[model samples]
Target: MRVYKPEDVPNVQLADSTRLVTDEAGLLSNAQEEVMNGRLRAIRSSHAVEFAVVTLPSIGDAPLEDFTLKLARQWGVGNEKNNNGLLLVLVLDQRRVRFETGYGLEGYLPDGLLSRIIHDRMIPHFRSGNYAEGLSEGVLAVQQVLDGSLEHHHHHH
Candidate 1:
């Protein structure tokens, strides 16, 4: 209802794929969903880190981060061995999108990094009401970071 908690999680079809592209709306006639699914797959296989996307658009007056953190831990994101779970959720109506990074990703997907990704990649497209574009680009940037490419290439050389 509000936070879309253990029962409010969109259709409970995560056994199939990950859906994205900024905000949520009738998702079809586009390739963003499958593209996100593929990239997320690469992310999990490459690092054994789990990533989840939720369509929960609201949660009463509660903070999105806290609510999402609750679900991430409850759902046991990532692998038990590494504790490398990640969750993506956005409430466009509230100008919010989040990537709840798990323990193992602290070194790579730092908290500041998530803000940067949204500020630089998604917000612009979101302003234009293109949720899918924003999500796709943002996820790509996420993958780059997770793959040891995004910020590191500019670090040493």
Candidate 2:
């Protein structure tokens, strides 16, 4: 539903396990089901999880993968201190979620964290079928370390 020129997100990269970034057609195909149902707002196929808002209702222009991760570092994770980096939240669909951060961030934010959070916070809420709540809660939890910069700045000033 949201098509942006590469210039807008010149740096936003997609998950490229195969060393291939996702094209518009590819993104449309992957989001086919959701788009048809009018439930999808964004789609990103970056090399890593760097700034993905997989939910609906559109959240402005999608960021370049690096821009997103850099934002995360600037905000909460402290790129300088916690370079393991942050997994920009990837796909978020019904009963499924995917994420990828650099090895450094992988150290602090691992798959285990995703599993527990999804199981404890996501599943319970989503079981009731409130996707917005589930997604919001899960994403926010991960962002606790993400939105760290605001808090840090606040403490100083």
Candidate 3:
């Protein structure tokens, strides 16, 4: 299957505080969106990490990983200094998910951890067709790991 970039699909802006969840595919319910909005806002404010979620039906001809990274960069998801941002891209119809992390977070959220989160924390719920739950759990897990690392980094300083 050919995978296209986000721009190939319906575009969504990462503007405003309440625009954290972009359910372009309409996968999430109102309640789920609200929950995500609150959690995302808190994560951003407390950790200076810009975490955003985007769901689309498909990606056209772009690879998942490449598309996700491009999206994050274009959107400028993370802080310029810390470069601490995470963009979770979910392509429902295509059954693909990508977690694009900023440079600053690479150490804390390595490829192994990201794979675990996707396969362990998110994929199960997603397989069960519980996207909302999967996303919520995955994001929370990321936040927890980041928070823990931040705390650890603090003591060492």
Q: Tell me how far the alpha carbon of residue 6 in candidate 2 is from the true structure, in angstroms, after superposition.
A: 16
lDDT of 2 by residue, 15-132 (tens): 3222112222222233432332221111111112233333322224554444435533433333453433343332222244444454544534676776677676677776686555
Ranking by TM-score: 3, 1, 2
Cα error of candidate 2 at position 85, Å:
5.1
Which portions of model 3 show Cα errors greater than 4 Å? 1-4, 8-14, 78-82, 151-157
Cα deviation of 62, candidate 2, in Å: 23
Q: Residue 139 of candidate 3: its Cα lDDT? A: 78
Off by over 4 Å in 2: 1-49, 55-94, 146-157
Backbone clashes, candidate 3: 7
lDDT winner between candidates 1 and 2: 1
Clashing pairs in 1: 4-8, 21-131, 21-132, 22-135
How many residue pairs clash in each candidate at the backbone level? 4, 17, 7
Model 2 local distance difference test score: 0.40
Residue-level lDDT tens digits of model 3 in 27-133: 78888888888888776666666778887776766588877777777677633422667788888766667787767667777757876888877889988888778
lDDT of 1 at 85: 64
Q: Which of 1 and 3 is the better model by TM-score?
A: 3
